[PDB]
Amino acid sequence: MKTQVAIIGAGPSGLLLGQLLHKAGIDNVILERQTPDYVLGRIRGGVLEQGMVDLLREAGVDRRMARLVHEGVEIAFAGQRRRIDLKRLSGGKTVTVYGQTEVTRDLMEAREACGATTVYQAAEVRLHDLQGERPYVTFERDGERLRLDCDYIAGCDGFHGISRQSIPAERLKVFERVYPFGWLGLLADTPPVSHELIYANHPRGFALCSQRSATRSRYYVQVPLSEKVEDWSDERFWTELKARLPSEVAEKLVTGPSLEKSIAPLRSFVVEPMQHGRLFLAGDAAHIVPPTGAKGLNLAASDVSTLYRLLLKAYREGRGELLERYSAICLRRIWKAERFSWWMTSVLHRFPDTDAFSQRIQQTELEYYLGSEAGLATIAENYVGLPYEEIE
Amino acid sequence: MKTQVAIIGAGPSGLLLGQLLHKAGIDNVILERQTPDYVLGRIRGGVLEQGMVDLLREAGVDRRMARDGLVHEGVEIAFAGQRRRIDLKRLSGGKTVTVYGQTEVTRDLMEAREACGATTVYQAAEVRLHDLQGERPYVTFERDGERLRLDCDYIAGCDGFHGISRQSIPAERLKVFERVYPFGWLGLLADTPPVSHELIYANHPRGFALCSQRSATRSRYYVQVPLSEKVEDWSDERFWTELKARLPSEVAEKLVTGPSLEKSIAPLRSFVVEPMQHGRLFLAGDAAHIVPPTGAKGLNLAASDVSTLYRLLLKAYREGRGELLERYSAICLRRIWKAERFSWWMTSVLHRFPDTDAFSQRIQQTELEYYLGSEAGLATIAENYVGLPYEEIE
Numbered sequence A: 001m002k003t004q005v006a007i008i009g010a011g012p013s014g015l016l017l018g019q020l021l022h023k024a025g026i027d028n029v030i031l032e033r034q035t036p037d038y039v040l041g042r043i044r045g046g047v048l049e050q051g052m053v054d055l056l057r058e059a060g061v062d063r064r065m066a067r068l069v070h071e072g073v074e075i076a077f078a079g080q081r082r083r084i085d086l087k088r089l090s091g092g093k094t095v096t097v098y099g100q101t102e103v104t105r106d107l108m109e110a111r112e113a114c115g116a117t118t119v120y121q122a123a124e125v126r127l128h129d130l131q132g133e134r135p136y137v138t139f140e141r142d143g144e145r146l147r148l149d150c151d152y153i154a155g156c157d158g159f160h161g162i163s164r165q166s167i168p169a170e171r172l173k174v175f176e177r178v179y180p181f182g183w184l185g186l187l188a189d190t191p192p193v194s195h196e197l198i199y200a201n202h203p204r205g206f207a208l209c210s211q212r213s214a215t216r217s218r219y220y221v222q223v224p225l226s227e228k229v230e231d232w233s234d235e236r237f238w239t240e241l242k243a244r245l246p247s248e249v250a251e252k253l254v255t256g257p258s259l260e261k262s263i264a265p266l267r268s269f270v271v272e273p274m275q276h277g278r279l280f281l282a283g284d285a286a287h288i289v290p291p292t293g294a295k296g297l298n299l300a301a302s303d304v305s306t307l308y309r310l311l312l313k314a315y316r317e318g319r320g321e322l323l324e325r326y327s328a329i330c331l332r333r334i335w336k337a338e339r340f341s342w343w344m345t346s347v348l349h350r351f352p353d354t355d356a357f358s359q360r361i362q363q364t365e366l367e368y369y370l371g372s373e374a375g376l377a378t379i380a381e382n383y384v385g386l387p388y389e390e391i392e
Numbered sequence B: 001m002k003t004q005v006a007i008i009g010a011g012p013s014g015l016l017l018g019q020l021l022h023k024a025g026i027d028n029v030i031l032e033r034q035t036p037d038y039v040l041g042r043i044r045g046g047v048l049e050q051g052m053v054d055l056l057r058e059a060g061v062d063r064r065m066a067r068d069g070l071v072h073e074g075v076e077i078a079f080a081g082q083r084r085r086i087d088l089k090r091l092s093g094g095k096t097v098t099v100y101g102q103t104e105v106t107r108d109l110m111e112a113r114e115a116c117g118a119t120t121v122y123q124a125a126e127v128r129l130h131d132l133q134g135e136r137p138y139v140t141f142e143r144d145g146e147r148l149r150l151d152c153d154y155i156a157g158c159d160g161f162h163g164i165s166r167q168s169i170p171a172e173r174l175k176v177f178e179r180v181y182p183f184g185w186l187g188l189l190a191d192t193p194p195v196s197h198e199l200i201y202a203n204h205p206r207g208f209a210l211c212s213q214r215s216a217t218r219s220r221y222y223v224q225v226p227l228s229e230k231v232e233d234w235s236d237e238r239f240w241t242e243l244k245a246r247l248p249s250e251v252a253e254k255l256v257t258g259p260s261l262e263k264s265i266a267p268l269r270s271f272v273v274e275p276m277q278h279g280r281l282f283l284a285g286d287a288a289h290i291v292p293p294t295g296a297k298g299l300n301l302a303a304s305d306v307s308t309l310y311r312l313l314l315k316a317y318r319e320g321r322g323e324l325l326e327r328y329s330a331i332c333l334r335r336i337w338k339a340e341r342f343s344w345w346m347t348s349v350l351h352r353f354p355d356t357d358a359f360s361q362r363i364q365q366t367e368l369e370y371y372l373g374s375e376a377g378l379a380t381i382a383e384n385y386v387g388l389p390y391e392e393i394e
Ligand SMILES: Cc1cc2nc3c(=O)[nH]c(=O)nc-3n(C[C@H](O)[C@H](O)[C@H](O)COP(=O)(O)OP(=O)(O)OC[C@H]3O[C@@H](n4cnc5c(N)ncnc54)[C@H](O)[C@@H]3O)c2cc1C
Pocket: A008, A009, A010, A011, A012, A013, A014, A031, A032, A033, A034, A039, A044, A045, A046, A047, A048, A100, A122, A125, A156, A157, A158, A159, A160, A161, A162, A163, A183, A185, A264, A282, A283, A284, A285, A291, A294, A295, A296, A297, A298, A299, A300
């Protein structure tokens, strides 16, 4: 098999890169380890910055202006709830709520409608000859070892993908912080308790209220790492959730059986550079932010945007070396999103063995940022997403 | 001996409080462990927020600071070899800071106090406080071998971090919040013209450095140093060499150096007690809290505690409203914690901490990039640097 760009991973990153490359007449084949249904079973997040919404349209999808709303942000702490006027504070921008499952299903449909190639259940993917002019990928599909020749490989295979693991260790510098807690998330077929995303810092720990539609909700509470999802019945989750929200919010919460429940570990992770020879990492394969800041998929989007654009230029100009700037460009946006996601996480969660001083400083941090126009502006401008870097 | 308000400490806090009390007609006596000469030997800092300047004027001690204080419209931060200016007046909406030595501030208050003929007992050894929860609190000290007693209505603990007043409150009624930093500030006062008209905070791989000033021909510099260092191991030349090594080459270039007038190492710490009072005793300034100096807030916080204490005491004395003093701690703490947060923040982004991992160091660099390069970020530094607005009282 042969193509121009071999894409590893049919998650949002790989599917979006695939659409953009196709639109620009660049052949690509995507190889995905799991089944289509398995990929679609991932719930993940629901907040998109405007950079992403336009890119989706530009990629030939987003024809579902419905099933997809705009919402504001609220932070509850120490007995109060402060709404962040995103629109007024950020120069007219806002975020869109849209489940990652729907985004992914939307891109899967846009690819299928193009007849483009996607190989699901591609096992044992291995990358080869990254420094050569003819790199290739080997994999197994129902018993047979297949091979895919290409000019470039985009590793869009997530945190535990094979592509970051195919770059010689010594070429990479790794930055990582692993948080001492995870997010127990619950998807429910109930109307959301607010039309505002609600982040809550509470003595018992963090909680978050979000939504997917008028009758579908998404909630999270932080939990320690020794906790197992089977130890948390739906009822136990709802009780802990209420115990962490302002009673005004809590009394009006409609509960119901979970449609999906899982615990996600939190971590900040970055590699530099994010490429090696003909391989370019994008999204979670190259970096991870804790979901507190809702930046993951949005960063994946801009990585994909830059990659798409630098590839297009290289072909058009018959010059690969332009591709050398990919890492530097992406990294500038990555680090800002890492700082904001780290900040949000650090001010909103309860950490183990925090002394009195630390606890008060965290409280004062919230008071100042939620009570000062300048403070509020730093939050809103970062949350709606900073400017799409220059690229090229 | 008797007075209305006994003040422990003849540092800026106590002097400023005594001055305002004097001017409002309230009797007060300051008792001080050191000698004038000693007090005046402390160099410390030099940045004043406007609230402090107005209080000094209200205290009737501002003519000289008007003539000799340097007002800055900006402050500068250097990191990754690049000075970034923070236009304070523009970002804060018109506010500025004034550079004026604490020694000069202290000298001016002492002068004012001496002219007024107000009471100040230097070398008052072994001060011990008594009967705080009663109606007739009193203090005892030793002056030239004899033990004297000073009876009063209220006691102002303005004796600094190592004072005696915070320690006179039953420990179990107080809650302590502290953070001790893994470094101190080696400061050098020199009679050379400052390398810059603006203050320059520098985050550098070798560690923090600060370029400040006191006049067109008097300078003040600092470099962070580990806690195992002793000043005597730092000759003026070792200092100049390390400072230059931490500054933009373009700055280190023009640096005029010279013999130190004074040198010392200040360890950094954050410290807050709650509450800040007990019976007739009220703590103010460094006796109640400490902030690392990166934020230039300590004396300014001292000024606002005193301002608040003075105002409530006038109400108690000029209205018999004695239970109104119950709100002192709560009022002060609101400003205190805001200064503690900013001071801690400044400290964390500007200094090098031991065994900090790679992610943590990159995050520090990213924080600087964001706050010195985004309008909103810059604004949060500026509005905090010029001092947030004093509270309301009551
Ligand atoms: C609780 C939670 C909430 C979040 N909230 C948000 C939010 O609201 N907004 C936001 O922007 N981000 C959010 N995120 C992050 C976001 O979900 C990720 O950033 C996004 O999934 C990254 O997409 P991706 O395509 O890079 O990787 P993935 O979605 O991980 O997809 C990589 C794909 O590659 C496949 N693959 C893996 N290994 C191989 C292999 N060896 N061979 C072939 N294929 C392979 C995987 O099966 C997968 O389908 C959240 C994440 C979590 C955990």
